[PDB]
Amino acid sequence: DELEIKAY
Amino acid sequence: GSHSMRYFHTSVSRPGRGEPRFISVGYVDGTQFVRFDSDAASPRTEPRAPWIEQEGPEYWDRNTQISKTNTQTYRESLRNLRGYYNQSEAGSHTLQRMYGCDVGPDGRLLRGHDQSAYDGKDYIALNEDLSSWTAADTAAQITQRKWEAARVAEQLRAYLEGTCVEWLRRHLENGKETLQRADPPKTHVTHHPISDHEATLRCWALGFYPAEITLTWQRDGEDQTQDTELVETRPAGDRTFQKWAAVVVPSGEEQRYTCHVQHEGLPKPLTLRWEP
Amino acid sequence: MIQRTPKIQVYSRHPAENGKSNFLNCYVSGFHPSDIEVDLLKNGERIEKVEHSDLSFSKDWSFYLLYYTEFTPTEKDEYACRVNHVTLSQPKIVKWDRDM
């Protein structure tokens, strides 16, 4: 799976 | 030998032409296996290698949701970075991220990666410790503070040491016949006179996988780095790669030049000469 | 904005044999930003429905794409790749040479 990233 | 799973994220704003496009492509080594494109008619995580197709609907649904969420997150982030750099709303900007894991022959984690760039320049990167960040500038320091405050490095470490390597090992097994097969280069040397004084010797490597290769020319047993023209390794479109190396030699001195080839698919390194 | 102009290579998937169907490749790489226009040309005219790879990038952040199409090379036919990018004032044409 991919990762759900956090906003910069 | 060693293996990697890497995802490559590109988000591009386009003021006056809608919201930013987000595309994610996933690779195991040099083999792409998934894509997601926010501009598609119906954006979905889609298979791009045959061995991934066997994954059930749960895989595709789960990854599609992640990518749909990431689309919005990257758009939010592009807005934020525009402000961090005091940039106009008129200009187009690019946010890229590469992340993933490397494992050894034993399948154990060698290291993880999470690097970002803005407008083609390093922006912020997770250090190899998977616990701290390197911010390129004061804008990126804002991101770093947000991520430090919110435990982002910890999330990345957990992902990279867990989910990432677990999925990489699973992919490597499902696609073992290709992902764990090194195809050697087919090699030959061509010759063409430039003038009465000189000729080009070009050493070819075709049909190899993976892309990593060493192609060098020696004269009298010594490497000819400065005088060698190396083209960038290029994809053939059948999973394999191509490369050549060329040196300009004085007429009649051809046999003083040897091309050397190292590649994983070779039982032994090769030494080639022009065979007239 | 520092932008990077595309490198261009035009070549065949398989070794060229006149009258034998093959694939014509135009590999554009090293460019930034990612928007780029790539045409494959047969005797100066644009080939229709050329396919391409999904956008990705190299370790230095520069983008690469492979554009490709079926072709059957002959002695007479000329093939080329025409590339436009924001870094280029005019489109750059790179001819196919079965020795490169």
Q: Which of B197, B175, B201 minimizes the C-alpha distance to B188?
A: B201
Nearest by CB to C11, from B121, B202, B234: name it. Answer: B234
* B141 shares a domain with B263: no
Evaluated on CA atoms C36, B39, B160, B170, the torsion sign reads: negative
* B173 shares a domain with B204: no
> What is the DSSP code (8-state) at residue C59?
T
**Residue B239 belongs to domain with CATH number:** 2.60.40.10
Asked if B99 contacts B90 with a C-beta cutoff of 8 angstroms, the reply is no
Radius of gyration of chain C (CA): 14
Surface of A (1-8) touching B: CB under 8 A:
1-8
- Closest residue of B to C13, CA-based? B236
Domain end, chosen from B160, B181, B202, is at B181
What is the domain extent for residue B240? 182-272
Domain end, chosen from B181, B211, B241, is at B181
* B169 shares a domain with B210: no
* B92 shares a domain with B56: yes
Number of C-beta neighbours around residue B261 at 10 A: 22
B138-149 vs B57-84: helix axis angle to the nearest 10? 130
Domain end, chosen from B155, B181, B207, is at B181
Please indicate whether, in this complex, the C-beta atoms of B62 and A1 are within 8 angstroms of each other: yes
Angle at B180 between CA B179 and CA B183, to 5 degrees: 90
Asked if C40 contacts C73 with a C-beta cutoff of 8 angstroms, the reply is no
* B107 shares a domain with B215: no
Q: How many domains does chain B have?
A: 2
Residue pairs between chains B and C whose CB atoms are closer than 8 Å: 72
> What is the DSSP code (8-state) at residue C13?
S
Q: How many residues does the structure list for chain A?
A: 8
**Residue B79 belongs to domain with CATH number:** 3.30.500.10
Q: Which tokens in the block code for residue B35?
A: 């894509």
Q: State the DSSP H helix or E strand holding residue B150, giving kind and residue range, or none if neither.
A: none
Q: Which tokens in the block code for residue B273?
A: 């000469």
Please tell me the distance from the alpha carbon of residue C54 to that of residue B34, in angstroms, as a whole number: 10
- Domains of chain C and any CATH numbers: 1-100 (2.60.40.10)
Asked if B189 contacts B270 with a C-beta cutoff of 8 angstroms, the reply is no
Please indicate whether, in this complex, the C-beta atoms of C54 and B48 are within 8 angstroms of each other: yes
> What are the angstrom distances between the C-alpha of B240 and each of B154, B178, B233, B263?
37, 11, 10, 13
Please indicate whether, in this complex, the C-beta atoms of B59 and A1 are within 8 angstroms of each other: yes
* B105 shares a domain with B167: yes
